[PDB]
Amino acid sequence: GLLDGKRILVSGIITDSSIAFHIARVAQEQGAQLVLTGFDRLRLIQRITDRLPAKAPLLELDVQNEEHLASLAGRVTEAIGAGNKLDGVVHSIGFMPQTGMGINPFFDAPYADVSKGIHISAYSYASMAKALLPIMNPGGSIVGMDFDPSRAMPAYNWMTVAKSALESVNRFVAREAGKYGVRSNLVAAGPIRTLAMSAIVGGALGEEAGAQIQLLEEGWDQRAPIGWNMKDATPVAKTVCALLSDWLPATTGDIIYADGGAHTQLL
Amino acid sequence: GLLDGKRILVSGIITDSSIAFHIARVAQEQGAQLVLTGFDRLRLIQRITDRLPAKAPLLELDVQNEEHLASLAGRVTEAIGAGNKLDGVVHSIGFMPQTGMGINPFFDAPYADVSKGIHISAYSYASMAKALLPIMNPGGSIVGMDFDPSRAMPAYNWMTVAKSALESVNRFVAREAGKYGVRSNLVAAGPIRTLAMSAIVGGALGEEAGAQIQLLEEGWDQRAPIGWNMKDATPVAKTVCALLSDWLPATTGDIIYADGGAHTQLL
Amino acid sequence: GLLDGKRILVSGIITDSSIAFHIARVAQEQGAQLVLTGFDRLRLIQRITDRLPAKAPLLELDVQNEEHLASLAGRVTEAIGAGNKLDGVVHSIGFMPQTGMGINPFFDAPYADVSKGIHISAYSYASMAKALLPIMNPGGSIVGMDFDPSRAMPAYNWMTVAKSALESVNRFVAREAGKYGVRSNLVAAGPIRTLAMSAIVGGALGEEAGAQIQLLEEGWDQRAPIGWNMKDATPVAKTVCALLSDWLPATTGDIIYADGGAHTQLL
Amino acid sequence: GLLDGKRILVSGIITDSSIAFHIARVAQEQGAQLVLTGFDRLRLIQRITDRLPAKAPLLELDVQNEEHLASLAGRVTEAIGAGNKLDGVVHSIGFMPQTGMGINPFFDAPYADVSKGIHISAYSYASMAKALLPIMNPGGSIVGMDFDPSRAMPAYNWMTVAKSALESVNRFVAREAGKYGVRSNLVAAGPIRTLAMSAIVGGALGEEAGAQIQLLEEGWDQRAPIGWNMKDATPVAKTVCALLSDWLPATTGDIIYADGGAHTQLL
Ligand SMILES: NC(=O)c1ccc[n+]([C@@H]2O[C@H](COP(=O)([O-])OP(=O)(O)OC[C@H]3O[C@@H](n4cnc5c(N)ncnc54)[C@H](O)[C@@H]3O)[C@@H](O)[C@H]2O)c1
Ligand SMILES: NC(=O)c1ccc[n+]([C@@H]2O[C@H](COP(=O)([O-])OP(=O)(O)OC[C@H]3O[C@@H](n4cnc5c(N)ncnc54)[C@H](O)[C@@H]3O)[C@@H](O)[C@H]2O)c1
Ligand SMILES: NC(=O)c1ccc[n+]([C@@H]2O[C@H](COP(=O)([O-])OP(=O)(O)OC[C@H]3O[C@@H](n4cnc5c(N)ncnc54)[C@H](O)[C@@H]3O)[C@@H](O)[C@H]2O)c1
Ligand SMILES: NC(=O)c1ccc[n+]([C@@H]2O[C@H](COP(=O)([O-])OP(=O)(O)OC[C@H]3O[C@@H](n4cnc5c(N)ncnc54)[C@H](O)[C@@H]3O)[C@@H](O)[C@H]2O)c1
Ligand SMILES: Cc1ccc(Cl)cc1NC(=O)[C@H]1CC(=O)N(C2CCCCC2)C1
Ligand SMILES: Cc1ccc(Cl)cc1NC(=O)[C@H]1CC(=O)N(C2CCCCC2)C1
Ligand SMILES: Cc1ccc(Cl)cc1NC(=O)[C@H]1CC(=O)N(C2CCCCC2)C1
Ligand SMILES: Cc1ccc(Cl)cc1NC(=O)[C@H]1CC(=O)N(C2CCCCC2)C1
């Protein structure tokens, strides 16, 4: 298997449609031994991850909780055994209050809300690296999930701004992680029809926002030279596993686009 | 003059070495009528701006103060006269707590501090646009100051992240400003030896940070095909005035590099 | 006027819809004294440029002709008078054989044809700089016309490749031009409905190619936060004049987007 | 093995220091069955490739020879057996006449020489795709070698321009290759001390050119957060194999940076 013998921490599972769920599944299919982290609804997350191919300990991690972050390495070590370290870390965490997305006007989002989104979606990539680098092996790999923010788009609003911040954080995390012989990269995925995204398309954050996302999805598959299936997270999960493997050893501070090639085409 | 008859708001003057001071001077030399905004030390700022070629009303604006922002358009209107609107707005505002820059480790900056920096340096570009767009004329221009954050660099740390966020905010502000017939752009300047920058080089945020910035400056002038003089803000001020003028009417959501061409050269 | 007293060479006029025609008109309105260069049909070009606001000498220049390039500086000097030099040069030249564009398959373009297109559209920017830099004043400006090639698009095919090459040539020309105190930049324009472009939309290079360009144009105005009028070259001409002026003195090796802001927006 | 059962064509071997030699070695270590192509010195190339872990047929291919390209698919089919197709193609071909590189002035390179370099280094990526796509399996992968040309640099001169053209060609090739279910990507490698590169450093294309490349190499390892070893092609070869594998299935028209992360860091 691609990840045989690797110990990998995967954050961000909340439903069976979470990108992290598919990352975890593919990593286990490829021989990785996982530790999972979940936010707030741990009973739910345990029941969800019961469906993964193999057993994996679940640890609580709210990335806005300083105590959780300060205890995290020790809790991971307890889970994988003293004297063992991680080979991989997956950050698949994102959040923006509803004022910061959808039809809610861009100018009307209070900074308190934007700040909460940037905390969870961008600063926490650095928070997790700080917490886990001391228990990572040389040759290891930190991977985060990104959505290409280099151009503005409808409805994504401040979440786009948070992703622009994350891309910058990643380049700095790479400097720190390099001291440990560890790589840091993001995977910029195309749109994936998770539960929350389906709810948005259905109008949860306003009708015109749903309409705009639907147009965005359609354009994506049209632009993608090999097409793009928003209902299939597996290609994205495979790409994360590629970055976790030994096969991209000279790539760091970087962004790998798992988007069907859409970002390379104007139309 | 390039800006004859234009009413322009300029924020960000705090010393005679502020980039905004030079923007204001050049804009006045080119016929613009200014309104100035200053943060906290208004007596100081008034004494500083007494040295500008012409009189300009000074208004208080702390961009973290919701009341200041809510009253700003009315205060500007009072200063320029009912029935008059602005043709231009200059955002020359930036701040990051010392934990977020210098030799202070990247991972050690508390989010409260980073958030304060992002508030002032990135979110406030949107805050000011929200406040002022309703009193801007079609054909008008909003300009912000940027430092190219597309690559990580030593010591700049979270301020780089804030600039990455600002570049994203600018692209969204352009969408809103377009509804008013108004352009929004950033000027990415090379390093300018302001008071604070000279203090950093002198070691105020740690010795190795000062050393690294000094190396950065030297490399900049070396890379720049037409050279780069860190002691001369005038080229930057001229570029801001170009964007405030009628001569770049089809440019918005964009970044103009006033950096000697350094970002186009590897070495 | 913005360009009062400046001596500027403008290449690329062939019809009254040429972008160069509008560049020349605006530059003359702003006080510039022009020298024009034309390819092959000089009687036609003279009759066309009779419609410009002021008289300007016309010189023959085929950029594939080594003798024309070797004699060009002396012929310009004769036209502007011994002891006078140019302050500006405008390259508004492009060509790709029909095999290299339209519905003709990308893989079917013979290299001889592609090479001819790259010669005229990219290498000639360096050819002209070589020829003219020795008779340019410090503070001068070389400007070329570009169409953003960072993403592939239908029908533009090898012309896109030639523009990618031109952007690279520009960054090297900036290194050479810097030795003379001269700037070199491109203006990346949105689509402009010139004679040839109208013919393409009308199906001259195949029906589906025309259809695709029409979709491209429509999308452009939709994406542009301030809109985009393909029938109006004046905004582009103004931008070229901005670069020819003294108001962007620290920009070189760079690309200024005169495209309504469309390239900053995904949709 | 990562590439078990895959039939892959590898071009560009000329010495045991060729990047293609290391690509071929790693691909064979991972179970790939190779077909090799060589230019001009086939006796030499056969003796060189005798050192690879396994036997691989060698075919002649001069990419400037239309007859070679027209016969190539049939010759490959003969080598791998009727009814078998390729899963992968590696383009590791580049050339620029000495007038187009080194201390020879940028402006002094004759177009005939530049054109020859662009033919071999950029157009041939499309030539090979045209030739081989009809005998490639769905899920297949075309990979080319790139050196990041987004910024100008000393001495690389017109080869940089050719790489800018190649990056554009790759985005179009991806459109064509998509019709076959095939991906097309480039790997942008850091500097590798091949025979020719060592000769350049030693002064073969002028003293100052050698000096500049040496400075470039040193800066590269300094900037790279995980370092960069110019004497080790294996990380680059592994990255090519990653792209040839099934593990990056949603990436096309793109560029993967195998450069130690140097391009993500300013200093
Ligand atoms: N869905 C897409 O279209 C798409 C596209 C590109 C990238 N991404 C990114 O992929 C990642 C995963 O998103 P997803 O689409 O799988 O949605 P998701 O809702 O399944 O995952 C988001 C995760 O963030 C977690 N989270 C929120 N607040 C947290 C906190 N305080 N502490 C810890 N975890 C917290 C949630 O519990 C959840 O597990 C995010 O970074 C998202 O931005 C998503
Ligand atoms: N100096 C450089 O090298 C350089 C390079 C590129 C860009 N820039 C940018 O140019 C802009 C101006 O910086 P500068 O170098 O002139 O330094 P400066 O210190 O003179 O200006 C920063 C300004 O921000 C103001 N400010 C801080 N907190 C504020 C608040 N709460 N509300 C309102 N204003 C507030 C300060 O009062 C000051 O006037 C900043 O955006 C900076 O990031 C500077
Ligand atoms: N029209 C658009 O949509 C558009 C958009 C962006 C950029 N541009 C660029 O603007 C420039 C001008 O194009 P245009 O649209 O005005 O079309 P145009 O046909 O009016 O101009 C092209 C010019 O190139 C000249 N030319 C061709 N071969 C030549 C040679 N051998 N020597 C000298 N001159 C030669 C032609 O005579 C003509 O004057 C080109 O670089 C084009 O790529 C055009
Ligand atoms: N060496 C580096 O520092 C470096 C860095 C990044 C990318 N690259 C790229 O990697 C690729 C391989 O270069 P390399 O460094 O291994 O050098 P190399 O000399 O070993 O390989 C270049 C190959 O191109 C072949 N070639 C030249 N003309 C040809 C023609 N007419 N038809 C077919 N093949 C022809 C040569 O025979 C040789 O096999 C090139 O694209 C190069 O630009 C090299
Ligand atoms: C592309 C786009 C446009 C507009 C809107 Cl409202 C949403 C999207 N898409 C998304 O929000 C996709 C991408 C993204 O970061 N998430 C996050 C998932 C976790 C909660 C915050 C949002 C889901
Ligand atoms: C380029 C660099 C590297 C490292 C450090 Cl510590 C500082 C700099 N440079 C600066 O901080 C320059 C650029 C910049 O945004 N400012 C801001 C000026 C206002 C207060 C916060 C910083 C001044
Ligand atoms: C954007 C696009 C797509 C497809 C096609 Cl066929 C044409 C265009 N557009 C153009 O060709 C525009 C842009 C451009 O470089 N020219 C050139 C004008 C001079 C002759 C060669 C083409 C005109
Ligand atoms: C980075 C740099 C700067 C200056 C010079 Cl002279 C050479 C280099 N480096 C190279 O030429 C490296 C990168 C590259 O494309 N090749 C090619 C190898 C095949 C023959 C043509 C050049 C080798």
Tab-separated table of C-alpha atoms and ligand atoms in Angstrom, chain C residues 11-21 23 37-41 45 61-65 68 91-96 116 119-121 124 128 144-148 156 159 163 166 187-197 217 228 230 236, ligand 3:
chain	number	residue	atom	x	y	z
C	11	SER	CA	3.892	50.699	-34.475
C	12	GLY	CA	0.938	48.551	-35.512
C	13	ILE	CA	-1.562	50.781	-37.272
C	14	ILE	CA	-3.215	49.043	-40.219
C	15	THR	CA	-6.903	50.159	-40.014
C	16	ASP	CA	-8.874	52.753	-38.092
C	17	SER	CA	-9.905	49.957	-35.735
C	18	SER	CA	-6.285	49.061	-34.830
C	19	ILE	CA	-5.587	49.450	-31.116
C	20	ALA	CA	-2.494	51.409	-32.208
C	21	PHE	CA	-4.640	53.918	-34.037
C	23	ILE	CA	-3.146	54.778	-28.840
C	37	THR	CA	5.742	52.658	-38.337
C	38	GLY	CA	3.740	50.513	-40.729
C	39	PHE	CA	4.021	47.103	-42.362
C	40	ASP	CA	3.722	46.454	-46.092
C	41	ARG	CA	0.687	48.572	-47.086
C	45	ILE	CA	-1.628	53.274	-43.629
C	61	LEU	CA	9.005	48.452	-40.652
C	62	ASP	CA	8.582	44.758	-41.326
C	63	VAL	CA	9.842	43.216	-38.094
C	64	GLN	CA	10.931	40.043	-39.948
C	65	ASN	CA	13.229	42.163	-42.137
C	68	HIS	CA	14.553	47.382	-41.789
C	91	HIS	CA	4.747	47.753	-29.885
C	92	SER	CA	1.234	46.912	-31.106
C	93	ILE	CA	2.159	44.061	-33.457
C	94	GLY	CA	0.816	40.529	-33.608
C	95	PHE	CA	0.204	37.836	-36.185
C	96	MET	CA	-0.464	34.119	-36.309
C	116	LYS	CA	6.339	32.889	-37.985
C	119	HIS	CA	8.644	35.810	-34.574
C	120	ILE	CA	6.210	38.602	-35.218
C	121	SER	CA	4.276	38.501	-31.967
C	124	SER	CA	9.967	41.303	-32.400
C	128	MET	CA	12.421	46.625	-31.605
C	144	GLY	CA	3.688	46.235	-25.721
C	145	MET	CA	0.173	44.813	-26.203
C	146	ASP	CA	-0.682	41.532	-24.528
C	147	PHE	CA	-3.732	39.271	-24.068
C	148	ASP	CA	-3.596	37.353	-20.736
C	156	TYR	CA	-6.753	31.415	-29.586
C	159	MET	CA	-1.442	32.899	-30.417
C	163	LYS	CA	1.684	35.779	-25.821
C	166	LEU	CA	6.000	37.703	-25.140
C	187	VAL	CA	-0.752	46.133	-21.323
C	188	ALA	CA	-3.015	43.093	-21.179
C	189	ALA	CA	-6.193	44.258	-22.832
C	190	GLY	CA	-9.635	42.733	-22.845
C	191	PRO	CA	-11.087	41.664	-26.225
C	192	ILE	CA	-11.457	44.506	-28.698
C	193	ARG	CA	-13.653	44.133	-31.748
C	194	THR	CA	-11.150	45.087	-34.429
C	195	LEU	CA	-11.845	44.299	-38.097
C	196	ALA	CA	-10.109	40.922	-37.872
C	197	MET	CA	-11.883	40.010	-34.643
C	217	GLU	CA	-16.581	38.333	-24.985
C	228	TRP	CA	-16.052	45.752	-20.545
C	230	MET	CA	-15.325	45.467	-26.678
C	236	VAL	CA	-6.804	50.627	-23.426
E	3	LIG	N1	-7.913	42.911	-30.559
E	3	LIG	C1	-7.875	42.358	-29.363
E	3	LIG	O1	-8.842	41.783	-28.882
E	3	LIG	C2	-6.570	42.318	-28.637
E	3	LIG	C3	-6.584	42.066	-27.265
E	3	LIG	C4	-5.408	42.143	-26.538
E	3	LIG	C5	-4.234	42.426	-27.187
E	3	LIG	N2	-4.224	42.619	-28.525
E	3	LIG	C6	-2.895	42.842	-29.224
E	3	LIG	O2	-2.839	44.178	-29.652
E	3	LIG	C7	-1.888	44.267	-30.745
E	3	LIG	C8	-2.535	44.977	-31.901
E	3	LIG	O3	-3.557	44.128	-32.442
E	3	LIG	P1	-4.917	44.714	-32.999
E	3	LIG	O4	-6.022	43.963	-32.337
E	3	LIG	O5	-4.878	46.195	-32.965
E	3	LIG	O6	-4.917	44.198	-34.511
E	3	LIG	P2	-4.296	44.900	-35.786
E	3	LIG	O7	-4.431	43.938	-36.877
E	3	LIG	O8	-4.949	46.186	-36.034
E	3	LIG	O9	-2.761	45.123	-35.480
E	3	LIG	C9	-1.766	44.114	-35.712
E	3	LIG	C10	-0.642	44.859	-36.381
E	3	LIG	O10	0.495	43.986	-36.559
E	3	LIG	C11	1.086	44.388	-37.775
E	3	LIG	N3	2.056	43.408	-38.237
E	3	LIG	C12	1.839	42.135	-38.687
E	3	LIG	N4	2.899	41.565	-39.216
E	3	LIG	C13	3.880	42.537	-39.093
E	3	LIG	C14	5.241	42.557	-39.463
E	3	LIG	N5	5.829	41.583	-40.148
E	3	LIG	N6	5.957	43.664	-39.166
E	3	LIG	C15	5.334	44.691	-38.569
E	3	LIG	N7	4.050	44.790	-38.195
E	3	LIG	C16	3.382	43.671	-38.485
E	3	LIG	C17	-0.097	44.601	-38.706
E	3	LIG	O11	0.302	45.341	-39.853
E	3	LIG	C18	-0.996	45.412	-37.779
E	3	LIG	O12	-0.693	46.797	-37.921
E	3	LIG	C19	-1.436	42.831	-31.014
E	3	LIG	O13	-0.296	42.558	-30.203
E	3	LIG	C20	-2.596	42.012	-30.462
E	3	LIG	O14	-2.154	40.695	-30.141
E	3	LIG	C21	-5.360	42.598	-29.247
